[PDB]
Structures are given as C-alpha cells and as structure tokens.
C-alpha cells in the first residue's frame, strides 16, 4: 500500500532520527527502585530544549516465550544489581505497517516510564499511554511514542507494550489447555498492576493514574475500565476514537487456530490439542506472516475484521478479562464510576482514503448500505425487505448527491466504526452509575507542517481533513516531526492537548484557565436528558459547540426504534 519512494523517505528518515537521538542523549544516567530491583535510565534532552529522564524496557512479566507463548503473563523474576534501562526493547511480533515484512520478537513485555524530575516535591499524576494499531501492530518506542511534550508538565508518563495478533489473541475451546484468550489484555493488567505498585519510585502519585488510549488503544482502555480484574487499579480514563463495543473490537476466534495451524504446515485433525502442539512449536514470524490470510471466505462475507483479538473467553480462569461480551460487562462495571473523557476527530473516516482508491468498487455498497446495517439487526442474507429499510435509512444519512461517493463512504466510515459505538455506549453507560462525569471533545484542527506515520500509512499527503490518528502530532513526538515555532497554530495545539490531558488526569475536569484559548469555556459533562451532546471542539480555537455528528448519529439509533432492546 505504501509507495516505493515513501518506503526510501521512510528509511532516510529512520537514520536521520537515529542520529537525533543520540544528540539528545546526555551523559547523566540515574538509578531508581522497583519492586523486582533497580533500574538504570537516562536524562533526554528534546527539541525545544526541555529534559526528562527516561527508563525504557523496564519488565513486567516473563517473557512469554516456550511454555508461556499464549499463557497469561507471569510475574517477572527479580534481579540483584542495575538493570540497563537506557535503550529500548523488541516490539511484539507483527507485520511493519510501512515495510511489510515481519519484525519484533516475543519478548516484548516491557513499559517504559518518563517524568522530569526523579525526586519532585509533590506526588505527581501518572498518566498511562495503550497504543493501537487493531491488536496487530503497535509498540512503545520513542520514534513513534515520544514523551518529549507531557515532559515539559509535571506527570509521569509511561507507555506500555503488550502482545498483539495470534501470539497475543489465540483463543481455544478446551480447559484442560489453559489458552482461554486475550493473554494480550491480560498483559495490559499486568503492566497496570506494576504501576500502582511501582510508580511512586518515580515521583507518581498511586492514587491518581490516568489510562488513555487511541484506537484499538482506546478499545483497551476501556476493557481496563470494564474487567473486575483492574477494579480500583486506576482514576480515570480517556477514550480516543474508539471503545470496547466498536464492531471492530472483538470477535470470537476459537475455531481459527486451526485454520492458522493448518496455513503453517500443520497436517492434522481439528482438536485442541494437537493444534495448540503444533503452534507451541511453530516460528513466531510464521504464525504472525500467515494471520492475514486465516479468515475464511464466509467470516469475509460476514465482514469479520480481524481474525484475532479480544473475545469472550469460553471458560473462567484466574485470570480472565472478558467473561461476557463487553456490552453485558458495562452493566456491572467498576470504570463506570470514574471520570471519563471521550472524543473523536472531525473526518475519522478519512483514514480509508487509500483503500477506496486501490478499490473504487467499494462505493457500490452505497448502493443499499445493507452491508453498514449492524448484525444483530440483519437478516442472514441481508436481504429482507426490513434490512432493505434500515440501508435505506443510512443512505439517507450519508448519501448526499445523485451518486454516492468516495467521501459519502468515509463519512459513513466514521459514524459505523467511531460515532455510532460511542452513541451507543453512552445510553448504555447511563443506566449502570452515579453521576459520575462524562466529557466529549471533538479534535478538528488540520495541519501538514506537524505529521505522523499514520499519514504515510493512509498514503495521505496533501489530504486535507483531520482523519483518524491525526490528533497523535499534538500528544507524542515521532520521528517525523519537527521543531515548531512557539507562535505556530501547530506548537499552541500540543500545549493546548497535552495541557486538557494533564488537567483531566490531575482533577477528572478537563477545564482549566490556564490553558490558552480555554478562559471563556463552560465544559458540561453529557447528562441522560440530554438530546444533543455538546462538546470541546478543538480547531485553532477551543468551542464549545453541538456535535456536528449528531444528525447522522440520531439516523444510525432510529435503524432500533422497533428494536429498542437491541440498542
């Protein structure tokens, strides 16, 4: 999908950053505490001159290799003398987004953590980074997950790894085997444990941590805020473009191990054991080459979209994470009653801009939108004349011309997979608390002078709108930004963002006075008589304004007005 003179911009630009980096590395190094012995991490310089000191590939579990590989993770072997902290760790085993070819290694259970003073005079808001990239891609490394912005506040910050794809994400039916599913958010509870337990040796306050997350990052997130596994670990949480009952969020993958097995060599029968057997034994590259080819051609046609990441787990174990489908867990669930913020970008769907034009067909789903109907509301066949109404209705909403078009179809893109499911878990999340606040932000400021790879990802250069993944500039430094004027739209947005952030997970209100451009906001959290959500529209100016989406969004709740029990 990316193009031969991107992948050599790319490449220059890895080696320009490497160099970088070693400008910004000074000679001080520093010593600190955790629970399995002492870690030694390094002061950082960045762009704009501001320092930090920096511990990266600090453990949190074994690695999950032999015996552990699709395990839960176990807790970590302790060590005499200083573990080096100073450089980076493996990412989990995936497919590189730019060059295409398998990277990382299964030892990948590591967080790093970031604050500019070791020793502060008050115990600091400890803000915790999940990134995205679907359950497949993702990692915790500086050239994409800088801390060089929150640095310049005092938080600490830590960015976690955990695993991803079939190595984090397999899932099987049989007890006796112990593989019940999601050992990747199992890490993720892991890693959240490990913070309440070691963050003070940082200058962090235990009882306030902040959990954020992009993406499937945001889908993370918020299981952490639904499984009882995490209950009290953490204060607040903030959703960005995304949530644990997005369609794409989870699936039910336990008859797909041995479809994978059987992509990889294995010569057998379908039974648990034996598939698991050969698995243990496989190449990690394999299985992780091969994921893309596992769904069938029916879960293809039942627009499954990835073959594995969270699923119900068939069993209960210690360690479980999700005993029933996430829509269920809302009902009981302990991050109800925390601050919560949640938010979206102004042309989610923007992010399908290469795809449609690899693949212009795609309009002709326009046609009847019968494949947008969400499934627990679609016939079979998706052929009924009531399904045919409920298209019908989403047409309406998207289509706006004679023809539907390329951009009617990212419009649609952004209300199925972002808009929609976050509606949808408000009304839900209202019945199950207390009052508990719940603020919207809409991130709606375009920019190409600030970038990140998500960008050449989406081959969107010169692309206006604010797709997908383009709000990631403002918060992390990355390998392809640059220094920005401290007068430029783009340098007042970082402060702008990382400062709402920092406010939110200081107090659980993301207003402050102090912020730039946000003296004259009056932030209300969403109540359940409201009809119309209002939220912080972030552009070159901060407004409160009516989501511009709710339009659209109140089409998408009428498709259930005569299945309300459905919504």
């Given at each position: 999908?990316?193009?031969?003179?991107?992948?050599?911009?790319?490449?220059?630009?890895?080696?320009?950053?490497?160099?970088?980096?070693?400008?910004?590395?000074?000679?001080?190094t520093?010593?600190?505490?955790?629970?399995?012995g002492?870690?030694?991490?390094?002061?950082?310089?960045?762009?704009?001159?501001?320092?930090?000191?920096?511990?990266?590939?600090?453990?949190?579990?074994?690695?999950?290799v032999?015996?552990?590989?699709?395990?839960?993770?176990q807790?970590?072997?302790?060590?005499?003398?200083?573990?080096?902290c100073?450089?980076?760790?493996?990412?989990?085993?995936?497919?590189?987004?730019?060059?295409?070819?398998?990277?990382?290694?299964?030892?990948?259970?590591?967080?790093?953590?970031?604050?500019?003073?070791?020793?502060?005079?008050t115990?600091?808001?400890?803000?915790?980074?999940?990134?995205?990239?679907?359950?497949?891609?993702?990692?915790?490394?500086?050239?994409?997950?800088?801390?060089?912005?929150?640095?310049?506040?005092?938080?600490?910050?830590i960015?976690?790894?955990?695993?991803?794809?079939?190595?984090?994400?397999?899932?099987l039916?049989?007890?006796?085997?112990?593989?019940?599913?999601?050992?990747?958010?199992?890490?993720?509870?892991?890693?959240?444990?490990w913070?309440?337990?070691?963050?003070?040796?940082?200058?962090?306050?235990?009882?306030?941590?902040?959990?954020?997350?992009?993406?499937?990052?945001?889908?993370?997130?918020?299981?952490?805020?639904?499984?009882?596994?995490?209950?009290?670990?953490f204060?607040?949480?903030?959703?960005?473009?995304?949530?644990?009952?997005?369609?794409?969020?989870?699936?039910?993958?336990?008859?797909?191990?041995?479809?994978?097995?059987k992509?990889?060599?294995?010569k057998?029968?379908?039974?648990?054991?034996?598939?698991?057997?050969?698995?243990?034994?496989?190449?990690?590259?394999?299985?992780?080459?091969?994921?893309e080819?596992?769904?069938t051609?029916?879960?293809?046609?039942?627009?499954?979209?990835?073959?594995?990441?969270?699923?119900?787990?068939?069993?209960?174990t210690?360690?479980?994470?999700?005993?029933?489908?996430?829509?269920?867990?809302?009902?009981t669930?302990?991050?109800?009653?925390?601050?919560?913020?949640?938010?979206?970008?102004?042309?989610?769907?923007?992010?399908?801009?290469?795809?449609?034009?690899?693949t212009?067909?795609?309009?002709?789903?326009?046609?009847?939108?019968?494949?947008?109907?969400p499934?627990?509301?679609?016939?079979?066949?998706?052929t009924?004349?009531?399904?045919?109404?409920?298209?019908?209705?989403?047409?309406?909403?998207?289509?706006?011309?004679?023809?539907?078009?390329?951009?009617?179809?990212?419009?649609?893109?952004?209300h199925?997979?972002?808009?929609?499911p976050?509606?949808?878990?408000?009304?839900?999340?209202?019945?199950?608390?207390?009052?508990?606040?719940?603020?919207?932000?809409?991130?709606?400021?375009?920019?190409?002078?600030?970038?990140?790879?998500?960008?050449?990802?989406?081959?969107?250069?010169?692309?206006?709108?604010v797709?997908?993944?383009?709000?990631?500039?403002?918060?992390?430094?990355?390998?392809?930004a640059?220094?920005?004027?401290?007068?430029?739209?783009?340098?007042?947005?970082?402060?702008?963002?990382?400062?709402?952030?920092?406010?939110?997970?200081?107090?659980?209100?993301?207003?402050?006075?102090?912020?730039?451009?946000?003296?004259?906001?009056?932030?209300?959290?969403?109540?359940?008589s409201?009809?119309?959500?209002?939220?912080?529209?972030?552009?070159?100016?901060?407004?409160?304004?009516?989501?511009?989406?709710?339009?659209?969004?109140?089409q998408?709740?009428?498709?259930?007005?005569?299945?309300?029990?459905?919504?």
């Open positions: 999908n990316v193009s031969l003179m991107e992948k050599l911009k790319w490449k220059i630009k890895c080696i320009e950053n490497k160099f970088l980096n070693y400008r910004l590395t000074t000679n001080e520093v010593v600190a505490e955790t629970e399995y002492k870690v030694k991490g390094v002061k950082r310089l960045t762009v704009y001159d501001d320092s930090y000191y920096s511990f990266e590939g600090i453990p949190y579990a074994q690695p999950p032999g015996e552990l590989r699709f395990k839960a993770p807790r970590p072997t302790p060590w005499d003398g200083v573990r080096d100073c450089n980076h760790k493996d990412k989990s085993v995936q497919v590189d987004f730019i060059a295409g070819k398998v990277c990382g290694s299964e030892d990948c259970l590591y967080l790093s953590v970031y604050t500019n003073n070791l020793n502060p005079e115990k600091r808001p400890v803000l915790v980074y999940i990134h995205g990239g679907d359950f497949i891609i993702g990692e915790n490394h500086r050239d994409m997950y800088g801390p060089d912005y929150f640095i310049k506040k005092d938080v600490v910050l960015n976690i790894q955990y695993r991803l794809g079939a190595l984090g994400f397999l899932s039916n049989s007890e006796d085997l112990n593989v019940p599913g999601n050992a990747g958010l199992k890490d993720q509870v892991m890693a959240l444990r913070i309440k337990n070691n963050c003070a040796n940082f200058g962090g306050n235990p009882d306030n941590i902040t959990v954020f997350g992009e993406s499937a990052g945001a889908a993370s997130t918020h299981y952490m805020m639904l499984t009882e596994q995490t209950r009290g670990l204060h607040r949480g903030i959703l960005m473009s995304g949530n644990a009952i997005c369609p794409w969020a989870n699936t039910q993958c336990q008859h797909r191990a041995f479809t994978l097995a992509l990889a060599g294995y057998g029968e379908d039974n648990d054991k034996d598939v698991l057997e050969f698995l243990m034994k496989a190449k990690p590259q394999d299985l992780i080459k091969l994921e080819k596992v769904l051609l029916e879960e293809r046609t039942n627009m499954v979209v990835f073959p594995f990441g969270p699923t119900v787990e068939p069993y209960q210690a360690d479980c994470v999700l005993p029933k489908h996430p829509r269920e867990m809302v009902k669930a302990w991050g109800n009653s925390i601050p919560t913020m949640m938010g979206n970008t102004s042309y989610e769907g923007l992010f399908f801009t290469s795809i449609l034009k690899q212009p067909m795609l309009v002709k789903e326009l046609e009847t939108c019968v494949n947008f109907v499934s627990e509301l679609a016939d079979a066949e998706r009924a004349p009531e399904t045919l109404e409920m298209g019908a209705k989403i047409k309406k909403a998207h289509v706006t011309g004679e023809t539907p078009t390329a951009d009617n179809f990212m419009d649609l893109c952004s199925i997979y972002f808009w929609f976050m509606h949808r878990l408000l009304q839900l999340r209202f019945n199950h608390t207390s009052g508990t606040p719940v603020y919207l932000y809409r991130f709606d400021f375009d920019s190409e002078d600030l970038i990140n790879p998500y960008r050449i990802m989406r081959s969107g250069r010169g692309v206006k709108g797709s997908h993944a383009d709000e990631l500039s403002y918060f992390f430094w990355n390998q392809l640059k220094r920005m004027p401290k007068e430029s739209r783009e340098y007042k947005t970082i402060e702008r963002m990382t400062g709402i952030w920092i406010q939110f997970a200081t107090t659980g209100n993301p207003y402050s006075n102090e912020i730039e451009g946000m003296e004259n906001v009056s932030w209300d959290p969403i109540k359940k409201d009809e119309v959500y209002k939220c912080l529209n972030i552009s070159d100016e901060l407004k409160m304004i009516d989501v511009p989406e709710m339009d659209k969004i109140k998408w709740e009428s498709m259930f007005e005569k299945h309300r029990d459905l919504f």
